[PDB]
Design an enzyme around this catalytic site. Structure first.
Site, PDB file in Angstrom:
ATOM      1  N   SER A  64      -1.860 -27.575  -0.677  1.00  0.00           N
ATOM      2  CA  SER A  64      -1.831 -26.460   0.312  1.00  0.00           C
ATOM      3  C   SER A  64      -0.418 -26.301   0.886  1.00  0.00           C
ATOM      4  O   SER A  64      -0.093 -25.296   1.487  1.00  0.00           O
ATOM      5  CB  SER A  64      -2.811 -26.877   1.408  1.00  0.00           C
ATOM      6  OG  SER A  64      -2.705 -28.277   1.624  1.00  0.00           O
ATOM      7  N   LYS A 102       6.354 -24.274   5.630  1.00  0.00           N
ATOM      8  CA  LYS A 102       6.549 -22.947   4.978  1.00  0.00           C
ATOM      9  C   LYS A 102       7.710 -22.200   5.634  1.00  0.00           C
ATOM     10  O   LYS A 102       7.890 -22.246   6.835  1.00  0.00           O
ATOM     11  CB  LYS A 102       5.238 -22.195   5.213  1.00  0.00           C
ATOM     12  CG  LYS A 102       4.413 -22.177   3.923  1.00  0.00           C
ATOM     13  CD  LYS A 102       2.969 -22.571   4.237  1.00  0.00           C
ATOM     14  CE  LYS A 102       2.453 -23.518   3.152  1.00  0.00           C
ATOM     15  NZ  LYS A 102       0.969 -23.390   3.202  1.00  0.00           N
TER      16      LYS A 102
END
Lengths: 115, 115
Positions: free
Chosen positions: A36, A73
């Protein structure tokens, strides 16, 4: 009691805390066992090393935090609130209305176990 | 009384020694600032993490040691004494006459600083 001791090498030392990091206590890490946040380096077989202490900057692989959330991210929050997953589901999407979106650390050292 | 697999995304304790490694004191590391053992992962900008304690096996990225030497590369010593640099100057060449060629640790975790 030696005929001529020149050096006493019986017990060395290893500063792991300063080895991979360099702070008294301001770094975070997480075991990579899924897919993820591979964007950070966690690809089901490695050890992520993030530094929770400084504030990274938009457009950088950092961990974001909101209401108790955490995800590595490169996201931009100054122009607009938007995040972009990179592990595999790449898709720039907005999060909220400028509520609480800020990075917790400022880096993510990927430790690839190579034996 | 809760037999659970893991389910944990937080750790106020910073066990770096157990974070990247997992031994009381049997691991070695070296700063990568050149290009002689990139085969291990040291490419002028990273942190190598080797475990000096167990005996690796020929045909594996391990650190060899002889007369006080330290090199990382997959070498074979059982059939014949042969070393092979992989950083960039690959050159399959023998070492000595079965004098003292053995690995010191059994792994080399490459820590790629990604910020």
């Amino acid at each position: 009691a030696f005929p001529s001791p020149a050096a006493d090498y019986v017990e060395q030392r290893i500063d792991l805390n300063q080895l991979l990091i360099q702070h008294p206590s301001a770094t975070y890490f997480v075991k990579a066992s899924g897919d993820s946040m591979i964007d950070g380096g966690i690809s089901d077989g490695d050890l992520l090393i993030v530094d929770s202490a400084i504030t990274a900057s938009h457009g950088d692989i950092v961990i974001a935090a909101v209401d108790g959330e955490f995800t590595v991210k490169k996201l931009q929050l100054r122009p607009t609130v938007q995040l972009i997953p990179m592990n595999s589901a790449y898709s720039p999407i907005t999060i909220s209305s400028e509520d609480t979106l800020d990075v917790f650390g400022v880096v993510i050292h990927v430790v690839k176990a190579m034996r």
